[PDB]
């Protein structure tokens, strides 16, 4: 009558982490810095676009003025 039976106990392997808290924090800090740099680039790019738009009008005005002056001088000369 040496017929034995058993029961079982369970253990849980550690969840997936303990490497997600050293590279993670550095990743977040770098992401924040990149976000700030992107915001600054946004602002600078908008300012540059405004300045180019401003330049356009003066360019067109000088072109028109020179063309009209040349035509007038030619007309009077002949």
């Amino acid at each position: 009558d040496m017929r034995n039976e058993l029961e079982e106990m369970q253990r849980r392997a550690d969840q997936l982490a303990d490497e997600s808290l050293e590279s993670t924090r550095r990743m977040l800090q770098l992401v924040e810095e990149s976000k700030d740099a992107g915001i600054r680039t946004l602002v600078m790019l908008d300012e540059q676009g405004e300045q180019l738009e401003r330049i356009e009008e003066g360019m067109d005005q000088i072109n028109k003025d020179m063309k009209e002056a040349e035509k007038n001088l030619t007309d009077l000369g002949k």
Binding site: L6, E7, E8, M9, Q10
Partner: protein, 83 residues
């Protein structure tokens, strides 16, 4: 008014082949109630510590909930233990 409680148990015994399971089945199908639970022999045992008692506890979980909710207007819950 009589202030009495209801019976909650029946036992049938005798020699083989004399009609015990038939009577239980016909009783089960005679009552306008839920679908009776059936336990076929040692169907509850489990090898993990504390897992063969949760099986016992699980059979009364609907009766307890309905008793808590509806009080004295609840239906009837049948349970059958074979062997």
């Amino acid at each position: 008014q009589m202030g009495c409680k209801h019976v909650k148990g029946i036992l049938l015994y005798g020699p083989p082949g004399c009609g015990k399971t038939l009577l239980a089945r016909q009783i089960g199908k005679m009552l306008n109630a839920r679908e009776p639970k059936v336990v076929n022999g040692p169907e509850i045992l489990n090898k993990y510590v504390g897992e063969s008692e949760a099986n016992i506890r699980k059979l009364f979980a609907d009766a307890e909930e309905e008793q808590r909710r509806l009080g004295a207007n609840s239906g009837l819950h049948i349970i059958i233990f074979d062997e």
